[PDB]
Design a protein around this motif. Sequence first.
Motif, PDB file in Angstrom:
ATOM      1  N   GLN A 136       6.871  63.416  31.187  1.00 25.53           N
ATOM      2  CA  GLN A 136       5.847  64.050  30.352  1.00 25.53           C
ATOM      3  C   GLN A 136       4.594  63.208  30.130  1.00 25.53           C
ATOM      4  O   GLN A 136       4.388  62.152  30.667  1.00 25.53           O
TER       5      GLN A 136
ATOM      6  N   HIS B 117       7.048  63.186  25.894  1.00 25.55           N
ATOM      7  CA  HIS B 117       5.732  62.612  25.824  1.00 25.55           C
ATOM      8  C   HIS B 117       5.634  61.204  25.236  1.00 25.55           C
ATOM      9  O   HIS B 117       6.246  60.946  24.170  1.00 25.55           O
TER      10      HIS B 117
ATOM     11  N   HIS C 202       1.198  68.881  22.274  1.00 18.31           N
ATOM     12  CA  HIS C 202       2.005  69.762  23.091  1.00 18.31           C
ATOM     13  C   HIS C 202       2.981  70.516  22.186  1.00 18.31           C
ATOM     14  O   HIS C 202       3.038  70.108  21.016  1.00 18.31           O
ATOM     15  N   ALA C 203       3.677  71.592  22.664  1.00 16.10           N
ATOM     16  CA  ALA C 203       4.558  72.215  21.660  1.00 16.10           C
ATOM     17  C   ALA C 203       5.751  72.963  22.313  1.00 16.10           C
ATOM     18  O   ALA C 203       5.707  73.252  23.488  1.00 16.10           O
TER      19      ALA C 203
ATOM     20  N   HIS D  10       3.445  67.114  17.895  1.00 13.68           N
ATOM     21  CA  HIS D  10       4.183  68.030  18.753  1.00 13.68           C
ATOM     22  C   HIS D  10       4.589  69.291  17.981  1.00 13.68           C
ATOM     23  O   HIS D  10       5.246  69.168  16.907  1.00 13.68           O
TER      24      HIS D  10
HETATM   25 ZN   LIG Z   1       6.390  68.878  24.489  1.00 16.13          ZN
END
Ligand SMILES: [Zn+2]
Lengths: 214, 214, 214
Positions: B76, B118, C82-83, C123
């Motif tokens: 990521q 991430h 990001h999610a 996130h």
């Molecule tokens: Zn993510």
Amino acid sequence: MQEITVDEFSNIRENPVTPWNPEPSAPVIDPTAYIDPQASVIGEVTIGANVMVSPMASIRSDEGMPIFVGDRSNVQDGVVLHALETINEEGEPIEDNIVEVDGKEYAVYIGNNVSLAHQSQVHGPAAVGDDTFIGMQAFVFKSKVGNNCVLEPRSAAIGVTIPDGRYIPAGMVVTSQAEADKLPEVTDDYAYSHTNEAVVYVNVHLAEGYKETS
Amino acid sequence: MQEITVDEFSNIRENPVTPWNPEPSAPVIDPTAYIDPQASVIGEVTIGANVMVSPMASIRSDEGMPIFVGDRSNVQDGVVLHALETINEEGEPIEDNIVEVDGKEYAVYIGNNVSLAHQSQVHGPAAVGDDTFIGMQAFVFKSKVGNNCVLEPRSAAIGVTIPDGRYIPAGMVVTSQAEADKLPEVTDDYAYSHTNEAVVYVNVHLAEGYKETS
Amino acid sequence: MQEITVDEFSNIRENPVTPWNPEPSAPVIDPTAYIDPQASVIGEVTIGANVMVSPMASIRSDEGMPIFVGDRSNVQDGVVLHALETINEEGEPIEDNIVEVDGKEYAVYIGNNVSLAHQSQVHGPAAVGDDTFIGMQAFVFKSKVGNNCVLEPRSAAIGVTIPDGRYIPAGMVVTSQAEADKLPEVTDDYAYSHTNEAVVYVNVHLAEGYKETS
Ligand SMILES: [Zn+2]
Ligand SMILES: [Zn+2]
Ligand SMILES: [Zn+2]
């Protein structure tokens, strides 16, 4: 998708004109340093000889300045160097955000033979003394790290002075002078006692090998 | 400013010639993996099928090598993979920096169906077993993480072996075998018990969708 | 080596077609925001006026969406947004992964005047209220951070709601509502009490200066 354009740009650039920076500056980089194409180096930065700057590092001297990286030091992947504003708007000197090393003022000072290992960060005002390893994901801010020190991975030094030759155990966040004073000493038998010299030897050689690819 | 040039380059490249690497190697990447244009992949790397490599990741096999990433795994955004020197200068094998998995030697081994979430990092020597989630900002170094494990966000494993099916609580830094041995088990009711399979399903599908944009 | 090609691409792009995203979306970015050429911004993202997005940041709305960043906020170097997946495959709403702010649904919501400092990450599902500083290397996931808060460096909020006007001490990982409820209050004398306003002032001015270089 549609590839908006092709995003053309230089990764080594001057800082922007701002209220605290009337005159833009471009990085001064020794011909023997290697800057990866996917690293970013902006503004009033000095990079020393034989330094390796890896992919995704971001050295940005557009707020606090200048940012110096000594000879034979390395700035590993994803490492960020940046700093708090060093100049006002009524004059300059914001002295609390300026570090002093050998009679010169810096927003960030990274000495010679220093390793900033992957994803670490040094945020000014800060100084890191020669031959120190700043471990993976570690953090230094508003602090002076002496020479021959070892910040193990995920350690941090915030608002303190780390005496020469000490180390900070992995994961430990040091926020008071009392605790910095009590850190353990680097001894011959300590697990990271030879880590920095090895890393510096390696990175000087990687900088040369990578220079031969450009 | 002045845009020095336009910085032309490939983000998938061979490693440089060094004293420990007489013969440069270029990454071996399955046609079904997706490497984002803003990721970097250098040197003796193997990338498996259906792997997604996101923006700002840096996979660099120029010191310790090789670095392998198994099928259907994902690396990521901002994730770094790198490793300690695996070869000497009097011969090769620096055995303490080499990990062994299914009869083959690697500097870093990332198994199949593994999520490196991430800003995490896996620094060799290290191995990460199949179906394990390495959480956001987590860290693995000089360690073997078993299969079906979960490193929650900001956990770390340094110099230890994490048994199969265990998890490391967010923020916890595991540096001793005694503590690794006592980690809690992944059970059906644990909060991250289904996280990895979901992430892998998603990332295999993102890799395919992104491949259709190139 | 051999420079495979020259890697041409746009850093501001639509998200890919997937099973949960039949119709690709491109970022909606105010003309007064600055996106560094070495930042990445993908998919269903809204970026507000005067926002600065620094080098190596990655804002990726390709799974959970949408990702919003309010006016005069800043996304510093190496910051990731990001999610988790917000839509199913039998219909849409995966309500547990969707945050609600002023009657609108988001995967990630970053309010106005918010600083996401270097190498931090937010996130989704997550919301961060106006005028809050998210410190260097900090982490927010499955949480709602109120307005006028301060996450000191290396703090984290996971699965909790941080009440308005509180701060999280450097290094502390908050994973329970009980502990979030007991955080200390920001007072005039607290060390980071004026940090966010300074950072926002600086970053709005850097965004303008950098816009004048493009
Ligand atoms: Zn993510
Ligand atoms: Zn900064
Ligand atoms: Zn390394």
